[PDB]
Design an enzyme around this catalytic site. Structure first.
Site, PDB file in Angstrom:
ATOM      1  N   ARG A   1      38.088  42.593  26.510  1.00  8.53           N
ATOM      2  CA  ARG A   1      38.783  43.775  27.014  1.00  8.53           C
ATOM      3  C   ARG A   1      39.130  44.677  25.829  1.00  8.53           C
ATOM      4  NH1 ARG A   1      37.015  41.467  30.832  1.00  8.53           N
ATOM      5  NH2 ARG A   1      37.985  41.377  32.899  1.00  8.53           N
TER       6      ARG A   1
ATOM      7  N   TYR B   1      29.843  30.621  35.679  1.00  3.62           N
ATOM      8  CA  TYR B   1      31.158  30.870  36.225  1.00  3.62           C
ATOM      9  C   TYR B   1      31.417  30.496  37.686  1.00  3.62           C
ATOM     10  CZ  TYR B   1      35.690  33.006  36.282  1.00  3.62           C
ATOM     11  OH  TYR B   1      37.049  33.139  36.293  1.00  3.62           O
TER      12      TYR B   1
ATOM     13  N   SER C   1      43.070  43.305  37.365  1.00  5.42           N
ATOM     14  CA  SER C   1      43.911  42.382  36.627  1.00  5.42           C
ATOM     15  C   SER C   1      44.884  43.234  35.866  1.00  5.42           C
ATOM     16  CB  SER C   1      43.076  41.588  35.627  1.00  5.42           C
ATOM     17  OG  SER C   1      42.147  40.758  36.278  1.00  5.42           O
TER      18      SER C   1
ATOM     19  N   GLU D   1      46.535  44.898  30.616  1.00  3.30           N
ATOM     20  CA  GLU D   1      45.151  45.297  30.395  1.00  3.30           C
ATOM     21  C   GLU D   1      45.012  46.730  30.912  1.00  3.30           C
ATOM     22  OE1 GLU D   1      41.709  42.780  32.029  1.00  3.30           O
ATOM     23  OE2 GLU D   1      41.343  44.630  33.150  1.00  3.30           O
TER      24      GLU D   1
HETATM   25  C1  LIG Z   1      39.860  46.234  42.070  1.00  4.71           C
HETATM   26  C2  LIG Z   1      39.508  46.301  40.616  1.00  4.71           C
HETATM   27  C3  LIG Z   1      38.723  45.283  40.067  1.00  4.71           C
HETATM   28  C4  LIG Z   1      38.399  45.300  38.701  1.00  4.71           C
HETATM   29  N1  LIG Z   1      37.594  44.334  38.176  1.00  4.71           N
HETATM   30  C5  LIG Z   1      37.278  44.315  36.852  1.00  4.71           C
HETATM   31  C6  LIG Z   1      36.421  43.233  36.254  1.00  4.71           C
HETATM   32  O1  LIG Z   1      35.997  42.356  36.996  1.00  4.71           O
HETATM   33  N2  LIG Z   1      36.187  43.268  34.937  1.00  4.71           N
HETATM   34  C7  LIG Z   1      36.633  44.250  34.122  1.00  4.71           C
HETATM   35  O2  LIG Z   1      36.358  44.216  32.970  1.00  4.71           O
HETATM   36  N3  LIG Z   1      37.412  45.243  34.638  1.00  4.71           N
HETATM   37  C8  LIG Z   1      37.742  45.308  35.930  1.00  4.71           C
HETATM   38  N4  LIG Z   1      38.527  46.258  36.495  1.00  4.71           N
HETATM   39  C9  LIG Z   1      39.039  47.263  35.525  1.00  4.71           C
HETATM   40  C10 LIG Z   1      38.280  48.596  35.582  1.00  4.71           C
HETATM   41  O3  LIG Z   1      37.302  48.639  36.594  1.00  4.71           O
HETATM   42  C11 LIG Z   1      37.682  48.918  34.191  1.00  4.71           C
HETATM   43  O4  LIG Z   1      38.668  49.093  33.203  1.00  4.71           O
HETATM   44  C12 LIG Z   1      36.750  50.135  34.221  1.00  4.71           C
HETATM   45  O5  LIG Z   1      35.929  50.187  33.061  1.00  4.71           O
HETATM   46  C13 LIG Z   1      37.509  51.452  34.416  1.00  4.71           C
HETATM   47  O6  LIG Z   1      36.544  52.472  34.693  1.00  4.71           O
HETATM   48  P1  LIG Z   1      37.149  53.875  34.949  1.00  4.71           P
HETATM   49  O7  LIG Z   1      35.993  54.856  34.958  1.00  4.71           O
HETATM   50  O8  LIG Z   1      37.886  53.829  36.269  1.00  4.71           O
HETATM   51  O9  LIG Z   1      38.182  54.250  33.758  1.00  4.71           O
HETATM   52  P2  LIG Z   1      39.502  55.036  33.782  1.00  4.71           P
HETATM   53  O10 LIG Z   1      40.586  54.214  34.445  1.00  4.71           O
HETATM   54  O11 LIG Z   1      39.242  56.382  34.382  1.00  4.71           O
HETATM   55  O12 LIG Z   1      39.777  55.213  32.229  1.00  4.71           O
HETATM   56  C14 LIG Z   1      39.893  54.053  31.404  1.00  4.71           C
HETATM   57  C15 LIG Z   1      40.340  54.415  29.995  1.00  4.71           C
HETATM   58  O13 LIG Z   1      39.180  54.946  29.265  1.00  4.71           O
HETATM   59  C16 LIG Z   1      39.273  56.371  29.060  1.00  4.71           C
HETATM   60  N5  LIG Z   1      37.980  56.916  29.457  1.00  4.71           N
HETATM   61  C17 LIG Z   1      37.642  56.854  30.773  1.00  4.71           C
HETATM   62  N6  LIG Z   1      36.351  57.506  30.762  1.00  4.71           N
HETATM   63  C18 LIG Z   1      36.110  57.981  29.387  1.00  4.71           C
HETATM   64  C19 LIG Z   1      35.102  58.725  28.600  1.00  4.71           C
HETATM   65  N7  LIG Z   1      33.964  59.179  29.130  1.00  4.71           N
HETATM   66  N8  LIG Z   1      35.338  58.969  27.281  1.00  4.71           N
HETATM   67  C20 LIG Z   1      36.496  58.529  26.737  1.00  4.71           C
HETATM   68  N9  LIG Z   1      37.436  57.852  27.311  1.00  4.71           N
HETATM   69  C21 LIG Z   1      37.166  57.625  28.642  1.00  4.71           C
HETATM   70  C22 LIG Z   1      40.506  56.787  29.840  1.00  4.71           C
HETATM   71  O14 LIG Z   1      41.129  57.894  29.220  1.00  4.71           O
HETATM   72  C23 LIG Z   1      41.358  55.509  29.873  1.00  4.71           C
HETATM   73  O15 LIG Z   1      42.073  55.304  28.624  1.00  4.71           O
HETATM   74  C24 LIG Z   1      38.859  46.287  37.864  1.00  4.71           C
HETATM   75  C25 LIG Z   1      39.632  47.332  38.430  1.00  4.71           C
HETATM   76  C26 LIG Z   1      39.954  47.355  39.782  1.00  4.71           C
HETATM   77  C27 LIG Z   1      40.741  48.419  40.525  1.00  4.71           C
HETATM   78  C1  LIG Z   2      39.478  41.837  37.986  1.00  2.00           C
HETATM   79  C2  LIG Z   2      39.338  41.899  36.630  1.00  2.00           C
HETATM   80  O1  LIG Z   2      38.684  41.002  35.891  1.00  2.00           O
HETATM   81  C3  LIG Z   2      38.751  39.697  36.292  1.00  2.00           C
HETATM   82  C4  LIG Z   2      37.372  38.959  36.539  1.00  2.00           C
HETATM   83  O2  LIG Z   2      36.709  39.526  37.642  1.00  2.00           O
HETATM   84  C5  LIG Z   2      37.541  37.447  36.766  1.00  2.00           C
HETATM   85  C6  LIG Z   2      36.196  36.687  36.902  1.00  2.00           C
HETATM   86  O3  LIG Z   2      35.303  36.852  35.840  1.00  2.00           O
HETATM   87  O4  LIG Z   2      38.166  36.961  35.569  1.00  2.00           O
HETATM   88  C7  LIG Z   2      39.423  37.507  35.254  1.00  2.00           C
HETATM   89  O5  LIG Z   2      40.428  37.162  36.144  1.00  2.00           O
HETATM   90  P1  LIG Z   2      40.830  35.674  36.170  1.00  2.00           P
HETATM   91  O6  LIG Z   2      40.801  35.092  34.778  1.00  2.00           O
HETATM   92  O7  LIG Z   2      42.171  35.564  36.854  1.00  2.00           O
HETATM   93  O8  LIG Z   2      39.624  35.119  37.024  1.00  2.00           O
HETATM   94  P2  LIG Z   2      39.841  34.071  38.096  1.00  2.00           P
HETATM   95  O9  LIG Z   2      38.594  33.234  38.237  1.00  2.00           O
HETATM   96  O10 LIG Z   2      40.173  34.713  39.427  1.00  2.00           O
HETATM   97  O11 LIG Z   2      40.865  32.937  38.042  1.00  2.00           O
HETATM   98  C8  LIG Z   2      41.080  32.300  36.721  1.00  2.00           C
HETATM   99  C9  LIG Z   2      41.964  31.028  36.991  1.00  2.00           C
HETATM  100  O12 LIG Z   2      43.204  31.446  37.509  1.00  2.00           O
HETATM  101  C10 LIG Z   2      43.449  30.763  38.694  1.00  2.00           C
HETATM  102  N1  LIG Z   2      44.391  31.573  39.480  1.00  2.00           N
HETATM  103  C11 LIG Z   2      44.229  33.034  39.498  1.00  2.00           C
HETATM  104  C12 LIG Z   2      45.123  33.752  40.243  1.00  2.00           C
HETATM  105  C13 LIG Z   2      46.176  33.005  40.984  1.00  2.00           C
HETATM  106  O13 LIG Z   2      46.954  33.628  41.676  1.00  2.00           O
HETATM  107  N2  LIG Z   2      46.244  31.689  40.874  1.00  2.00           N
HETATM  108  C14 LIG Z   2      45.414  30.924  40.151  1.00  2.00           C
HETATM  109  O14 LIG Z   2      45.553  29.726  40.086  1.00  2.00           O
HETATM  110  C15 LIG Z   2      42.060  30.556  39.312  1.00  2.00           C
HETATM  111  O15 LIG Z   2      41.946  29.679  40.339  1.00  2.00           O
HETATM  112  C16 LIG Z   2      41.252  30.275  38.116  1.00  2.00           C
HETATM  113  O16 LIG Z   2      40.960  28.885  37.997  1.00  2.00           O
HETATM  114  C17 LIG Z   2      39.246  38.996  35.053  1.00  2.00           C
HETATM  115  N3  LIG Z   2      40.273  39.335  34.106  1.00  2.00           N
HETATM  116  C18 LIG Z   2      40.593  39.257  32.843  1.00  2.00           C
HETATM  117  C19 LIG Z   2      41.974  39.928  32.644  1.00  2.00           C
HETATM  118  O17 LIG Z   2      40.008  38.753  31.971  1.00  2.00           O
HETATM  119  C20 LIG Z   2      39.887  42.975  35.758  1.00  2.00           C
HETATM  120  O18 LIG Z   2      39.708  42.904  34.504  1.00  2.00           O
HETATM  121  O19 LIG Z   2      40.526  43.962  36.264  1.00  2.00           O
END
Ligand SMILES: Cc1cc2nc3c(=O)[nH]c(=O)nc-3n(C[C@H](O)[C@H](O)[C@H](O)COP(=O)(O)OP(=O)(O)OC[C@H]3O[C@@H](n4cnc5c(N)ncnc54)[C@H](O)[C@@H]3O)c2cc1C
Ligand SMILES: C=C(O[C@H]1[C@H](O)[C@@H](CO)O[C@H](OP(=O)(O)OP(=O)(O)OC[C@H]2O[C@@H](n3ccc(=O)[nH]c3=O)[C@H](O)[C@@H]2O)[C@@H]1NC(C)=O)C(=O)O
Length: 340
Positions: free
Chosen positions: A157, A188, A227, A323
């Site tokens: 991240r 995973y 997250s 994050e």
């Molecule tokens: C439901 C949900 C699930 C998610 N799951 C994951 C996941 O599984 N793994 C994961 O890693 N993240 C996850 N995220 C986090 C998120 O999707 C990421 O951080 C993503 O990269 C944000 O994209 P964005 O375009 O919405 O950025 P924004 O929220 O619009 O911006 C993010 C940051 O970067 C800057 N930025 C944005 N675009 C640009 C650009 N072109 N140039 C310079 N700066 C810029 C912004 O100013 C801000 O500081 C999740 C979020 C949500 C809501």
């Molecule tokens: C959704 C995001 O990213 C997600 C990504 O999709 C998933 C899978 O790869 O792994 C991260 O969550 P995570 O580490 O909680 O992934 P999970 O697999 O759901 O769970 C990790 C461990 O926590 C446990 N868990 C999670 C939530 C909860 O309420 N209880 C619990 O016990 C799970 O069962 C698991 O054994 C990301 N986050 C970070 C901060 O590293 C995001 O960044 O916004």
């Protein structure tokens, strides 16, 4: 004036101006005009990773620079993707076109331009795996610049864009490299049930989405930024001390010997699922996610984060770091500091 439709959290604050940049020239002009008026500038993709703490005193540029180009090399597909392209749509696109390699990153919200910033990762893959380079425009000089994946200093991240290259540069395009020889990442969770020989990219795609749609809330329903905290990396010792008393703690042993803990689990163990402050709450299907359950005010989200962080700190003596990017009135502020 309202930022509400520009952040998945659904926070309702205002900005002096909000402008959509359909191309780089527009983004640059927008940035130039705003800074000349002494105003701060924020670039957003889909605002799915930001928490507006209050009204923004400057201009918010919605990056909508779109387009995709595919360059073929004997060994892989090289994609030059506009910063404004929707990530999930890109993943589906790539799969549709028979160019797998992005399936583990399916359903992750946001724009492609934002993908390198926090090195998007889920289900065993992080963008650093398929990132070739990132093209930016140095906002103050107009000079387009390219950073190789290595020069991006990708981390968990983390990337150079969250440090040295923040604000000076606006990401305009991301180059992805997808090997022609596909190799599934089935390390995973539920993915380990799939067979590397029989499995198809689409099957990994569905497996990934299934786990995601069962745990993560759709912003259309309840606003959220995914997250809310990073999974903390504690020293091998603190991990020793912690796993003894809390044996079933999911943990991911690190390179340097340190150990990453699952933040959602730590929060869950504090019986915080469903806890709400104002219109914000701890998601019941994944405690690491804070949601806008009912017209949450940003302060509701900050105090909920504070509570979650404190409880987890008192119980496990593990201190969670957000994050999500916290945007103050003049720009990003320290999230930890804000929720301390
Ligand atoms: C439901 C949900 C699930 C998610 N799951 C994951 C996941 O599984 N793994 C994961 O890693 N993240 C996850 N995220 C986090 C998120 O999707 C990421 O951080 C993503 O990269 C944000 O994209 P964005 O375009 O919405 O950025 P924004 O929220 O619009 O911006 C993010 C940051 O970067 C800057 N930025 C944005 N675009 C640009 C650009 N072109 N140039 C310079 N700066 C810029 C912004 O100013 C801000 O500081 C999740 C979020 C949500 C809501
Ligand atoms: C959704 C995001 O990213 C997600 C990504 O999709 C998933 C899978 O790869 O792994 C991260 O969550 P995570 O580490 O909680 O992934 P999970 O697999 O759901 O769970 C990790 C461990 O926590 C446990 N868990 C999670 C939530 C909860 O309420 N209880 C619990 O016990 C799970 O069962 C698991 O054994 C990301 N986050 C970070 C901060 O590293 C995001 O960044 O916004």
């Amino acid at each position: 004036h309202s930022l509400k439709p520009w952040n998945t959290f659904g926070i309702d604050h205002n900005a002096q101006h909000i402008v959509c940049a359909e191309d780089e020239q527009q983004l640059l002009n927008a940035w130039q005009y705003a800074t000349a008026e002494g105003q701060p500038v924020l670039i957003l993709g889909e605002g799915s990773n930001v928490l507006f703490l209050e009204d923004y005193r400057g201009t918010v540029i919605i990056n909508r620079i779109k387009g995709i180009e595919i360059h073929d090399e004997p060994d892989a597909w090289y994609l030059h993707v506009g910063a404004g392209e929707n990530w999930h749509r890109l993943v589906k696109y790539t799969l549709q076109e028979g160019m797998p390699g992005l399936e583990n990153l399916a359903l992750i919200p946001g724009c492609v331009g934002s993908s390198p910033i926090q090195n998007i990762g889920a289900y065993g893959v992080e963008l650093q795996r398929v990132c070739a380079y990132v093209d930016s425009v140095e906002l103050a000089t107009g000079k387009q610049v390219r950073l190789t994946a290595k020069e991006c200093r990708f981390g968990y991240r983390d990337s150079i864009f969250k440090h040295e290259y923040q604000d000076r540069f606006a990401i305009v395009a991301v180059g992805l490299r997808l090997p022609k020889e596909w190799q599934p990442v089935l390390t995973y969770g539920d993915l380990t049930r799939l067979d590397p020989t029989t499995v198809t990219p689409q099957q990994v795609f569905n497996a990934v989405c299934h786990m995601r749609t069962t745990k993560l809330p759709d912003p259309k329903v309840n606003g959220n930024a995914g997250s809310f905290f990073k999974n903390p990396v504690v020293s091998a010792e603190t991990a020793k001390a912690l796993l003894s008393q809390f044996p079933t703690a999911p943990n991911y042993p690190q390179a340097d010997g340190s150990v990453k803990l699952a933040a959602g689990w730590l929060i869950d163990q504090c019986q915080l699922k469903g806890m709400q402050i104002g219109g914000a709450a701890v998601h019941r299907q994944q405690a690491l996610v804070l949601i806008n359950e009912d017209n949450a005010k940003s302060e509701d989200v900050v105090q909920l984060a504070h509570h979650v962080r404190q409880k987890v700190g008192e119980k496990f003596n593990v201190w969670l770091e957000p994050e999500v990017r916290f945007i103050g009135a003049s720009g990003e502020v320290s999230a930890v500091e804000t929720i301390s």
